[PDB]
Amino acid sequence: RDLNDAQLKFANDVESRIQRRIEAILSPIVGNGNVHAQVTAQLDFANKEQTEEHYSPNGDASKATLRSRQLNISEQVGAGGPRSTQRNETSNYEVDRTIRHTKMNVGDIERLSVAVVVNYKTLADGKPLPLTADQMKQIEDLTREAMGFSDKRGDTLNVVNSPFS
Amino acid sequence: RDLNDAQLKFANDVESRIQRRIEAILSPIVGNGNVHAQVTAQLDFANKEQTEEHYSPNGDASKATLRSRQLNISEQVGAGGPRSTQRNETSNYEVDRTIRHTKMNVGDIERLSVAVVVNYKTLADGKPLPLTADQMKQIEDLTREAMGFSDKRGDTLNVVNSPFS
Amino acid sequence: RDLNDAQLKFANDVESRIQRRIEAILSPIVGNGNVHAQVTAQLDFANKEQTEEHYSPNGDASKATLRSRQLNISEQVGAGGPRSTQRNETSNYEVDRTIRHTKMNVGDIERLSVAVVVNYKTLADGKPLPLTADQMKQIEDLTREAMGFSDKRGDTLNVVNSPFS
Structure with a gap:
């Protein structure tokens, strides 16, 4: 089981780099x-692996390309009346074509979850007090930008403020 | 039975890493x-292994691509009446096509279950008392974020607060 | 897992170069x-990989190129009346054609997120005060130009002003 042992080490490095990035940005604001x-x-x-092939539509005559065409009218009016209208048409087209071949990478990030706790000092000498809502929002925005939120990916973030021991 | 012996060791490492992560995040809040x-x-x-092949629909004429077409009208009005309308049509199409080949990994996590117990101190010198509901909710959210809850996967979490010995 | 280890180092260099560029431009304005x-x-x-093939439309007669053509009129007026009009036409065309083959690079930037914090001095000896809105806008514009905002790419920027410790 050598493959799984190496895989666990790789996941540890990804989390380690993100962890210290959040610590560094928020360290001056709140403390060391x-x-x-x-x-x-x-x-x-x-x-x-994935292969995609797409063709541009050519239903409209203005945006169509023709290699050959045949078109015959027949129209006989008779009097003494009959009207034997007739029409034949054959068309050949040259169409646009696009092919993309993609080989995806191994080791990408599917989803991240981060939990952050901050302390109660709030004062030089008095009893600890809760931080302000605006400061909490600023901290949340900064850690969100540091960690790289992506709503469509499914990221989750939770920050709580509580005393330390 | 060498394969099964190595498999058990791999499962131990996965649980060991998650266990200390929950301990580290919650250690400052409640205690060492x-x-x-x-x-x-x-x-x-x-x-x-899995192979998928998908074709984009082309029922609508606006989004269809044509390589060739034949289309003949015949229409004879007679008087003295008969109306022998006739129509023939043949169409060929060029369709989009996508192929993805996937070879899945071995050793993924199917489901996780974590149980956490916390102590009763609640006071410097008085008798132990239960913790507050808000603090319990904060602890639950933090351990949930640390362990990586996924509702669709089927994760289960249970945290209880009781005295220690 | 040697490939993933080298990939993480490459991502660190990209962020490192951008980080010091923002620091250098804003250093004289606010401080060292x-x-x-x-x-x-x-x-x-x-x-x-991608291959594209495009054909210029030739529906209009003025912008069409012909290699050959056949065109026959038949028209018989009878009196004593019948009018047996008849028309046949066959056309061949030479069409424009363009092919581009593209092999994309590995290691491009998909999205960037930057968070910047600035200090409260605002005075030589008095108590710290918030910076002006115009100065904050200037700082935001300068860091945006330094980092390389692209709205269609999906970049995000967040700058907050708060005291330091």
Whole structure:
């Protein structure tokens, strides 16, 4: 089981780099040792390939390309009446064509979850007090930008403020 | 039975890493030695392959691509009446096509279950008392983010608060 | 897992170069050590190929090229009346054609996120005060130009002003 052992080490490095990035950005604002963050990562390890072929529509006559055409009219009016109208048409077309071949990578990030806790000092000498809502929102925005939120990917973030021991 | 012996070791490492992650995040809030967590993991070890082929629909004329077409009208009005309308049409199309080949990985996580117990101190010198509902909710959210909840996957979490010995 | 280890190092260099560029441009305005910035990057590592083939339309007669043509009129007026008009036409065309083959690069930037924090001095000796809106807008514009905003790509920027410790 050598493959699984190496895979676990790779996932540890991804989380380690993100963890210290959040610590570094928030360290000056709150303090050197008043922030803690833990990051868990889910990685895709499957091998995938994809081939796509697309054709541009040519229903409209203005945007159509023709290689050959045949077109015959027959029309006989009779009096003394009959009207034997007749029409035949054959058309050949040259169409646009696009092909993309994609071989995806192994080790991408599928989803991330980060939890951050901050301390209660709030004062030089008085009793600890909760932080302001605006400051909490600023901290949330900064850690969100640091970690790389993507709503469509499915990221989750949770930050709580509580006293330390 | 060398394969099964190595498989058991791999499952132990996955649970070990998750266990200390929950301990580290919750250690400052409650204390150094006032938290205990145990993690059990179910791993998929089957070999799977999959091939998918998809075609884009072309029922609508506006989004259709044509290589050739034949179309003949015949229409004879007679008087003295008969109306022998006739129509023939033959069409050929060029269709989009996409192929993905996927070879899945061995050793993924199918489901996780974690149980966490926290202590009763609640006071410097008085008798132990239960923790607050808000603090319990914060602890639950933090451990959920640390462990990586996924509702569709089937994860289960249970946290209880009780005295220690 | 040697490929993933090297990939992580490459992403670190991209963020490192951008980080010091923002620091250098904003250093004289605010101060030597009154600015902090952290950059996270998402890189595409997939292998992709694409082939495109396009044909210019030739529906209009003025912009059409002909290699051969056949065209026969028959028209019989009878009196004592019948009018047996008849028309046949066959046309061949020479069409324009363009082919581009593209092999994309590996390691491009898909999206960037930067968070910047600035300090409160605002005075030589008095209490710290918030910076002006115009100065904040100037700082935002300068860091945006330094980092390389692209609206269609999906870039995100967040700058907040708060006291330091």
